[PDB]
Amino acid sequence: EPATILLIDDHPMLRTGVKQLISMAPDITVVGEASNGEQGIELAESLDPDLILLDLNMPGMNGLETLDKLREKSLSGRIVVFSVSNHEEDVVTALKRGADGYLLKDMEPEDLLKALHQAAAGEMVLSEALTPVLAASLERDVNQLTPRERDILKLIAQGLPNKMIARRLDITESTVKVHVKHMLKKMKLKSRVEAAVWVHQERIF
């Protein structure tokens, strides 16, 4: 079963290249497409895909607001935003706001494929460079987690993809997804990257 991807954009040339690359990676696949944030946000919660690709440059000049609304939803997957902004601080703001990654729209095809496959199906840990930054941005009642939720949190913090977590814990990805949503909600962590940083600072494990 290939990893699931939801595309939220209003940039045809971008969608084309992304869908072209995805069609050449047997283990990752597009499960939905939305041309505006309102549509995509509702689709994200219902499909609960492994990866949600969000265009921060759609009509409205409100990419961050759309990231916020998306992030308010109960999701177990990763969120990677696309933007034409080269402002270094924008990568930091996206991460602080709930994105697990940030990509420019001008990447070489092979570099974009590697990024897409990693985001949807590979291990993903935040760079040492941005780590101190999200750390500072970061109440959490860890004892409210069930054993399984703690095991889920520990592996999520390792940057492991759902298939790898499902296997290590001998549970289906469906179950992994259910636990990830519950755990993030209880710990008040906005994202999987936020969970890896929290666990790291606290050394809860």
CSV table of C-alpha atoms in Angstrom, one decimal:
chain,number,residue,atom,x,y,z
A,1,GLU,CA,0.0,0.0,0.0
A,2,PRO,CA,1.6,3.3,-1.1
A,3,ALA,CA,1.9,6.3,1.3
A,4,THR,CA,-1.0,8.8,0.8
A,5,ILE,CA,-0.6,12.4,-0.3
A,6,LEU,CA,-3.1,15.3,-0.4
A,7,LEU,CA,-2.4,18.2,-2.7
A,8,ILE,CA,-3.7,21.7,-1.7
A,9,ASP,CA,-2.7,24.3,-4.3
A,10,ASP,CA,-3.9,26.7,-6.9
A,11,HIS,CA,-0.8,26.6,-9.0
A,12,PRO,CA,-1.3,24.3,-12.0
A,13,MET,CA,2.3,24.1,-13.2
A,14,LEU,CA,3.3,23.1,-9.7
A,15,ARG,CA,0.6,20.4,-9.4
A,16,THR,CA,1.7,19.0,-12.7
A,17,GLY,CA,5.3,18.5,-11.8
A,18,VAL,CA,4.5,17.2,-8.4
A,19,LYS,CA,2.0,14.7,-9.8
A,20,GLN,CA,4.4,13.7,-12.5
A,21,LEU,CA,7.1,12.9,-10.0
A,22,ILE,CA,4.7,11.1,-7.7
A,23,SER,CA,3.5,8.9,-10.6
A,24,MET,CA,7.1,7.6,-10.8
A,25,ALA,CA,7.4,6.6,-7.2
A,26,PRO,CA,5.4,3.3,-6.8
A,27,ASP,CA,5.3,3.7,-3.0
A,28,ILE,CA,3.7,7.1,-2.7
A,29,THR,CA,0.5,8.2,-4.2
A,30,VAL,CA,-1.9,11.2,-4.5
A,31,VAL,CA,-5.2,10.5,-2.8
A,32,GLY,CA,-6.8,13.9,-3.1
A,33,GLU,CA,-6.6,17.4,-4.7
A,34,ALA,CA,-8.1,20.7,-3.6
A,35,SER,CA,-7.8,24.2,-5.2
A,36,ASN,CA,-8.5,26.3,-2.1
A,37,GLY,CA,-7.8,26.0,1.6
A,38,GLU,CA,-11.4,25.6,2.7
A,39,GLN,CA,-11.8,22.6,0.4
A,40,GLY,CA,-8.4,21.1,1.2
A,41,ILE,CA,-8.8,21.5,5.0
A,42,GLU,CA,-12.0,19.5,5.0
A,43,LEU,CA,-10.4,16.8,2.8
A,44,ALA,CA,-7.3,16.6,5.0
A,45,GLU,CA,-9.4,15.7,8.1
A,46,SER,CA,-11.4,13.1,6.3
A,47,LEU,CA,-8.6,11.4,4.3
A,48,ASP,CA,-6.0,11.9,7.1
A,49,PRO,CA,-3.2,11.3,4.6
A,50,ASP,CA,0.5,10.6,5.5
A,51,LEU,CA,1.4,13.9,3.8
A,52,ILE,CA,-0.4,17.1,3.0
A,53,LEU,CA,1.3,19.5,0.5
A,54,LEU,CA,0.2,23.1,1.0
A,55,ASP,CA,0.7,26.0,-1.4
A,56,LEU,CA,1.2,29.1,0.7
A,57,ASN,CA,0.8,31.3,-2.3
A,58,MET,CA,-2.9,30.6,-3.3
A,59,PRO,CA,-5.3,33.5,-3.9
A,60,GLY,CA,-5.9,35.4,-0.7
A,61,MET,CA,-2.5,36.3,0.6
A,62,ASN,CA,-3.3,34.1,3.6
A,63,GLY,CA,-1.1,31.0,3.4
A,64,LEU,CA,-0.2,31.1,7.1
A,65,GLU,CA,-3.9,31.4,8.0
A,66,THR,CA,-4.6,28.4,5.9
A,67,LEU,CA,-1.8,26.5,7.6
A,68,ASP,CA,-3.4,27.5,10.9
A,69,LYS,CA,-6.8,26.2,10.0
A,70,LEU,CA,-5.3,23.0,8.5
A,71,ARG,CA,-3.3,22.5,11.7
A,72,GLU,CA,-6.4,23.0,13.9
A,73,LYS,CA,-7.8,19.7,12.3
A,74,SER,CA,-7.2,16.3,14.0
A,75,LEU,CA,-4.4,14.9,11.8
A,76,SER,CA,-1.8,12.2,12.1
A,77,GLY,CA,0.3,13.0,9.0
A,78,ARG,CA,3.0,15.4,8.0
A,79,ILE,CA,2.4,18.8,6.5
A,80,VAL,CA,4.9,20.3,4.0
A,81,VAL,CA,4.4,23.8,2.6
A,82,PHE,CA,5.4,25.1,-0.8
A,83,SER,CA,6.3,28.7,-1.2
A,84,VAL,CA,8.2,31.1,-3.5
A,85,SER,CA,9.5,33.1,-0.6
A,86,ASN,CA,13.2,32.9,0.0
A,87,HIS,CA,12.9,34.8,3.3
A,88,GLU,CA,14.8,32.6,5.7
A,89,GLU,CA,12.5,33.6,8.5
A,90,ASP,CA,9.6,32.2,6.6
A,91,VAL,CA,10.9,28.6,6.9
A,92,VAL,CA,11.1,29.2,10.7
A,93,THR,CA,7.6,30.7,10.9
A,94,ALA,CA,6.0,27.8,8.9
A,95,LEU,CA,7.7,25.3,11.3
A,96,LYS,CA,6.6,27.3,14.3
A,97,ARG,CA,3.1,27.3,12.9
A,98,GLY,CA,2.8,23.6,12.3
A,99,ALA,CA,4.5,22.6,9.1
A,100,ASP,CA,6.9,19.6,9.3
A,101,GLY,CA,8.8,20.9,6.3
A,102,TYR,CA,9.0,23.8,3.8
A,103,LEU,CA,10.0,23.5,0.1
A,104,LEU,CA,10.6,26.1,-2.6
A,105,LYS,CA,8.7,25.7,-5.9
A,106,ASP,CA,11.9,25.8,-8.1
A,107,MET,CA,13.5,22.5,-7.0
A,108,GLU,CA,15.3,20.2,-9.5
A,109,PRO,CA,13.0,17.3,-10.3
A,110,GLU,CA,15.3,14.7,-8.6
A,111,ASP,CA,15.7,16.8,-5.5
A,112,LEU,CA,11.9,17.3,-5.3
A,113,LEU,CA,11.3,13.6,-5.7
A,114,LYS,CA,13.7,12.8,-2.8
A,115,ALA,CA,12.0,15.4,-0.6
A,116,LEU,CA,8.5,14.2,-1.5
A,117,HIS,CA,9.3,10.5,-0.9
A,118,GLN,CA,11.0,11.4,2.4
A,119,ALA,CA,8.1,13.5,3.5
A,120,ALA,CA,5.5,10.9,2.6
A,121,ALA,CA,7.4,7.7,3.3
A,122,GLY,CA,10.8,8.2,4.9
A,123,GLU,CA,12.4,9.2,8.2
A,124,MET,CA,12.4,12.9,8.8
A,125,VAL,CA,14.3,14.8,11.6
A,126,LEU,CA,14.6,18.5,11.9
A,127,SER,CA,18.0,20.0,11.1
A,128,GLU,CA,20.3,21.0,13.9
A,129,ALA,CA,20.1,24.5,12.5
A,130,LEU,CA,16.4,25.0,13.0
A,131,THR,CA,16.2,22.8,16.2
A,132,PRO,CA,17.2,25.6,18.7
A,133,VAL,CA,14.7,27.8,16.9
A,134,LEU,CA,11.6,25.7,17.4
A,135,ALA,CA,12.8,24.7,20.9
A,136,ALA,CA,12.6,28.4,21.9
A,137,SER,CA,9.1,28.6,20.4
A,138,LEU,CA,7.9,25.8,22.6
A,139,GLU,CA,2.2,22.7,30.3
A,140,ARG,CA,2.3,19.2,28.8
A,141,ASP,CA,0.8,16.5,31.0
A,142,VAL,CA,2.7,13.4,29.7
A,143,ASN,CA,1.1,11.2,32.4
A,144,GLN,CA,-2.2,11.6,30.6
A,145,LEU,CA,-0.8,9.3,27.8
A,146,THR,CA,-1.7,5.6,27.7
A,147,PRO,CA,1.3,3.2,27.2
A,148,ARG,CA,0.6,2.8,23.5
A,149,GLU,CA,0.4,6.6,23.1
A,150,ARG,CA,3.8,6.9,24.8
A,151,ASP,CA,5.3,4.2,22.5
A,152,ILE,CA,3.7,6.1,19.6
A,153,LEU,CA,5.2,9.4,20.8
A,154,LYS,CA,8.7,7.9,21.3
A,155,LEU,CA,8.8,6.6,17.7
A,156,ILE,CA,7.2,9.8,16.2
A,157,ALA,CA,10.0,11.7,18.0
A,158,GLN,CA,12.5,9.5,16.2
A,159,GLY,CA,11.2,10.9,13.0
A,160,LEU,CA,9.9,7.5,11.8
A,161,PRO,CA,7.2,7.2,9.1
A,162,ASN,CA,3.9,5.4,9.9
A,163,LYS,CA,4.8,2.1,8.2
A,164,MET,CA,7.9,1.8,10.3
A,165,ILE,CA,6.0,2.7,13.5
A,166,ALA,CA,3.2,0.2,12.7
A,167,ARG,CA,5.8,-2.6,12.2
A,168,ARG,CA,7.8,-1.9,15.4
A,169,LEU,CA,4.7,-1.8,17.5
A,170,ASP,CA,2.9,-4.6,15.6
A,171,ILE,CA,-0.2,-2.6,14.8
A,172,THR,CA,-1.8,-1.4,11.6
A,173,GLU,CA,-1.0,2.1,10.2
A,174,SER,CA,-4.7,2.9,10.8
A,175,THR,CA,-4.2,2.3,14.5
A,176,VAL,CA,-1.0,4.3,14.4
A,177,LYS,CA,-2.9,7.3,12.9
A,178,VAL,CA,-5.6,7.1,15.6
A,179,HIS,CA,-3.0,7.1,18.3
A,180,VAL,CA,-1.0,10.0,16.8
A,181,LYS,CA,-4.1,12.2,16.6
A,182,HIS,CA,-5.1,11.4,20.2
A,183,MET,CA,-1.5,11.8,21.6
A,184,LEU,CA,-0.9,15.2,19.8
A,185,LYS,CA,-4.2,16.5,21.1
A,186,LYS,CA,-3.5,15.5,24.7
A,187,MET,CA,0.1,16.8,24.6
A,188,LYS,CA,-1.0,20.0,22.8
A,189,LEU,CA,1.8,19.5,20.3
A,190,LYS,CA,0.9,21.1,16.9
A,191,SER,CA,2.8,18.6,14.8
A,192,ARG,CA,5.0,15.6,14.5
A,193,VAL,CA,8.2,17.8,14.4
A,194,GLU,CA,6.9,19.7,17.4
A,195,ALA,CA,6.7,16.3,19.2
A,196,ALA,CA,10.2,15.4,18.2
A,197,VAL,CA,11.6,18.7,19.6
A,198,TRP,CA,9.5,18.5,22.8
A,199,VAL,CA,10.6,15.0,23.6
A,200,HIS,CA,14.2,16.1,22.9
A,201,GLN,CA,14.2,19.1,25.2
A,202,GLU,CA,12.5,17.2,28.0
A,203,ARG,CA,14.3,14.0,27.4
A,204,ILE,CA,11.1,12.4,28.6
A,205,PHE,CA,12.6,9.2,27.3
